[PDB]
């Protein structure tokens, strides 16, 4: 079947999709669907479909968690979050990242701090991920910076960041494992800077039961009926 006939067969399921995405997200998913309609090769169409899969999931992730969807290009790096949130330590950040300058450009799906987006409570987010992981067996990985063996304190508030990595791919374990491995160096770097950060990473795939994703079930039916069917019809034909 011709690419342009697959798009037509799935114009309604992709309109239901684009209708539920954050404004900047749905505009991106819309531009990509057109590229797929005018795709001159099964290669370029796959590459476009891949980007819709991840972008549309990240928007439904922002929705379920009531966070802000920020298009990749507009996403902050690790260096930008410290510069703005820990200026007294950015200079020492740069000094301790001479042999690992790539750390500065690391760009998670969500770079938040507690009241760079702001979040009410970092400990609340970590509890929700740890809860679903324990109740539903969803693979997560979590790392918290911790200078020496320092204790939490009740007499003073510290500024803190929350780094989240999401993903919609078949290999859920490999993603959480490879994500948490990339942040280990920076987590141990923040420890040596006395900066409190928390790294959370998760992933969903299409075999995950519809009630156990990191996005609302409704969003799940929206992705399976559109981006999944596409991939089915994109290979078969």
């Amino acid at each position, epitope marked *: 079947k011709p690419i342009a006939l697959i798009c037509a067969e799935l114009y309604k399921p992709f309109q239901d999709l684009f209708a539920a995405l954050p404004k900047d997200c749905s505009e991106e998913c819309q531009t990509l669907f057109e590229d797929i309609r005018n795709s001159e090769s099964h290669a370029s169409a796959w590459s476009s479909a891949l980007r819709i899969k991840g972008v549309a999931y990240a928007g439904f992730f922002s929705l379920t968690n009531s966070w802000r969807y920020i298009p990749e290009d507009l996403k902050p790096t690790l260096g930008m979050a410290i510069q703005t949130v820990f200026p007294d330590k950015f200079e020492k950040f740069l000094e301790r990242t001479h042999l690992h300058p790539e750390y500065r450009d690391f760009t998670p799906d969500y770079l938040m701090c507690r009241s760079v987006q702001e979040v009410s409570s970092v*400990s609340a987010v970590v*509890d929700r991920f740890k809860s679903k992981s324990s109740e539903k067996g969803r693979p997560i990985r979590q790392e918290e910076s911790r*200078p*020496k*063996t*320092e*204790s*939490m*304190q*009740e*007499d*003073i508030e*510290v500024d803190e960041l929350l780094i989240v990595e999401v993903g919609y791919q078949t290999d859920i374990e490999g993603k959480v494992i490879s994500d948490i491995e990339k942040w280990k160096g920076v987590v141990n770097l923040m420890s040596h800077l*006395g*900066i409190k950060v928390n790294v959370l990473t998760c992933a969903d795939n299409s075999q995950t039961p519809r009630t156990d994703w990191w996005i609302d079930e409704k969003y799940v039916r929206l992705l399976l009926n559109s981006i999944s069917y596409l991939f089915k019809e994109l290979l078969e034909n």
Partner: antibody
Amino acid sequence: EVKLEESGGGLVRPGGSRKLSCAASGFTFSSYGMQWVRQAPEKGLEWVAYISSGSRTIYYADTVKGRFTISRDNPKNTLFLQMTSLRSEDTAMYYCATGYGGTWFAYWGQGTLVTVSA
Amino acid sequence: QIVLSQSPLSLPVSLGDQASISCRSSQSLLHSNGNTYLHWYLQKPGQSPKLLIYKVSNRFSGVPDRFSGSGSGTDFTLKISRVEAEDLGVYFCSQSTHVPYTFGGGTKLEIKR
């Protein structure tokens, strides 16, 4: 007046278990981390466990890890210590304490004596 | 673990005189949030401990001003400006900068006679 009242001490055979409780009064107990400290007879103080106000963070001394559980019921203004697989070296006076605004031991109970012995 | 070393073990002191107790830390007690969680307690014989000083030099409410503390990093001192008969007992420093929270072994204040 801030007061902490421990209960639950007594005689316990080695290998046995005991649950200690601490009733808190005179402050909003739910807003503060709570601690257990112990003192073997004729010895110094030895910290046992900490629990944050919302129970999200819990700390243990290595000597009790895997045997003791700290917990709290904030609506009931009560702190607990579940002790299991007790050894004679656990024989101590057990105090609950709190900082009422920090991780130092500002307020102490009168303590309750736990004797582990056959 | 952070080891707190108290000196002297025992401090005979005449009524009215000053007393000083030292507490040395095996690692800095400066927390990454800027505070230093080194505290001083008194345990009179047969009673539960009482806080005297928290975070190095802050006198706890109700504590007589003859008690004071000073220091930073790894070295800390508790001063009793003018010893009273009631000041009899064991003095402990303790730190809550690092888990596990730890105590020194205690200094036994002894009244000279």
